[PDB]
Structure formats: structure tokens, C-alpha cells
């Protein structure tokens, strides 16, 4: 017999919206991003690694304190938060005053998908 | 200033296709499903948990041998493999002879999205 196939459309966005809920409730967040003001951001190591390798570099270079990765000086919540939110939604939420800094941050991470978006 | 927003369309499928590549290369696979013939299936614990809680129940009930979860008798590769592939793609690939068993398995997991698909 021949193998048949049926699908469920809009599964990508549906699956993505599920991971956003987990990110909102800090469910199964293995990676803890810790900023300069001791504020934390619980994320999924899989979601970030699927969008860039920059966070994988930080884990081998930056210091770790009690399961919390210390973010470098140029990589704080002003740029990290809206970029991570983009990974979970596909939407970049930002103020116009943050444009240049987000662009330079995107170049630093070499996040191509975010580079093209900012350079429309 | 007002917060602005730009987006990248088809991000859901794009992000989903990234996780499929990781699943193909066994990259960052934390959960190891071990079948009766000692065959293994490397999966992501996040992807499965986002589609059902059934695998979370197996981790608290079924035995674990060297980071490998022992699958129950009714839950083997004949049904597990095509169902997991659905989670990563949104497409259920199967033979017609497996229809009834996949349906009963879906009822057992209470995977609603797969139930409606099979009961079109």
C-alpha cells in the first residue's frame, strides 16, 4: 500500500503560539539571561539556537552564576528583550530611538533575518 | 514616542522548519525514546510538550534507563514515529492500514488536533 498524507494548515503559527505561552509562564525555561541590574529573563535554549548561534557563543565565553548567564555590556534588556520576542512571534516591537542600536546588535549577532527586516 | 512594529511573514513555518533540521541531526535532543527492539528516537522535550502532555506522563510513570525513556507496549515506533513527525511538520504521514491504530493512540494521548485530522 502507498503511504498517504493529510495535514493541518497554520500549524507553524499554532506551534509557535504554544511556545510563546511557555515563554510567558517561564515553563521549561532552561536558560536564564541575567542583566546588569540583576534582572532576569527566562528563555528556551532551543528557540534561541534555532534563530542564531550568538547565545551559544555567550555560554562558552561569558561567565555563569547559578544557572544564570551573565550578559555582556552591549547586550542588555533594551535590545535583548525585543529581539527574543521576535523569535517567539516573528514581530519586532521597538521604539524608533532604538533603531540604530538594534541594527548594530543584529550585525553583531549576524542575525540575517533581523538584518533584512531592519534594512527594508 | 510610540512603539512601532515590523514583522517577518511565514515566520511560523520558517521557525518550524529550523526545529525539523535539528530533529534530523539529533541536535540538542534531550529526550531519548527507546522502543522494544532497542531502537532509539531522539526528540526535543519542548516540541512534544507543546503538542501534548502524554510524554510528560510517561516520564513520571515509565522506567528510565540511561537517559532513555522506555516506551509502553501500545506506544511503539509504528505509531510514535509518524506522530512525532506530525509535531515537527504539521503533516501526518501514514499507511491506511495504520489508520485505526493511530486513531486509538491519538485518543489515548487525547491529542485533540490529531483527533480532528483523522476524523475529517
Numbering used by the authors:
A (entry chain A), B (entry chain A): 2 to 121
Paper text:
The Drosophila melanogaster centrosome associated protein at 190 kDa (CP190) was first identified as a MAP using MT affinity chromatography. CP190 is a large multi-domain protein that has a distinct localization pattern that is tightly coordinated with the cell cycle. During interphase it is restricted to the nucleus where it serves as a key component of chromatin insulator complexes that spatially organize the genome. Upon nuclear envelope breakdown, a population of CP190 redistributes to the centrosomes and the spindle.
To gain structural insight into the conserved CP190 BTB domain, we purified and crystallized native and selenometionine-substituted BTB (residues 1–135). Crystals belong to the space group P3221 and contain one CP190 BTB molecule in the asymmetric unit. The structure was built and refined to 2.5 Å resolution, yielding R and Rfree values of 21.9 and 25.9, respectively. The final model contains residues 2–121. The BTB domain forms a homodimer across a crystallographic 2-fold axis, adopting a canonical homodimeric structure as found in the BTB-ZF subfamily of BTB domains. Each chain in the homodimer has an α-helical core composed of six helices, α1- α6, flanked by a four stranded β-sheet (β3-β2-β5-β4) and a two-stranded inter-molecular β-sheet formed by β6 and β1' from the homodimeric mate. Key dimer contacts are made at this hydrophobic interface as well as a reciprocal N-terminal β-strand exchange in which β1 extends along the base of the homodimeric mate, forming a two-stranded antiparallel β-sheet with β6'. Along the homodimer’s two-fold axis, α1 makes key hydrophobic interactions with α1' from the homodimeric mate. We analyzed the oligomeric state of the BTB domain using SEC-MALS. We conclude the highly conserved L20 residue is critical to support homodimerization.
